[PDB]
C-alpha cells in the first residue's frame, strides 16, 4: 500500500518519490531526500511554507474548511492559491497518489 508523488523543481521540475499510505510528518520528500530545495525550512512544527507545497487543487480544493485558525502558518503563503496547503503533520493519502507538488519558491 504505497503511493507515488511528483515534486516540481526549477531545472526540469518533475521530481518524484514513493510514499506509504499513512506516512508520517516531514516524510516522503526526505524519505527519499528529494531535491526539495529547502528541506523543511523550519524543520517542521509549523513556521515555514515549504513543506507540503502546491497540492493538486483536486486534493486541497476538496476541503470546505480553512481560516486564520486552520491556516496557522499559511495565511498568505506567497504562492498559495487553491491547491497548496501546509501540512508537515499529515499522513499520506490516496488522493496524493500520483500528486504533483510544487514549491511556492521562498
What backbone torsions phi and psi does residue 58 show, to the nearest 5 degrees? Answer: -70, -5
How many residues line the site for ligand FES (CB under 6 A)? 11
CB of 72 to ligand FES, least distance (A): 9
Residues 13-72 that bind ligand FES (CB under 6 A): 40-42, 44, 46-48, 51
Residues 82-101 that bind ligand FES (CB under 6 A): 86, 88
Nearer residue to ligand FES within complex by CB, 47 or 59: 47
For the beta carbon of residue 64, count every other beta carbon within 10 angstroms. 5
DSSP 83: S
| C-alpha cell belonging to residue 8 | 516540481
78 in Cβ contact with 69 (< 8 Å): no
**Number of continuous H segments (helices) and E segments (strands) in the chain:** 3, 3
Is there a binding annotation on residue 48? yes
CB of 96 to ligand FES, least distance (A): 16
The footprint of ligand FES (CB under 6 A) covers 40-42, 44, 46-48, 51, 73, 86, 88
Amino acid at each position: 500500500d504505497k503511493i507515488t508523488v511528483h515534486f516540481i523543481n526549477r531545472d526540469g521540475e518533475t521530481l518524484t518519490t514513493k510514499g506509504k499510505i499513512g506516512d508520517s510528518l516531514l516524510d516522503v520528500v526526505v524519505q527519499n531526500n528529494l531535491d526539495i530545495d529547502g528541506f523543511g525550512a523550519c524543520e517542521g512544527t509549523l513556521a515555514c511554507s515549504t513543506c507540503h507545497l502546491i497540492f493538486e487543487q483536486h486534493i486541497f480544493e476538496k476541503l470546505e474548511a480553512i481560516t486564520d485558525e486552520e491556516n496557522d502558518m499559511l495565511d498568505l503563503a506567497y504562492g498559495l492559491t487553491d491547491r497548496s496547503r501546509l501540512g508537515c503533520q499529515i499522513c499520506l493519502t490516496k488522493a496524493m497518489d500520483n500528486m504533483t507538488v510544487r514549491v511556492p519558491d521562498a
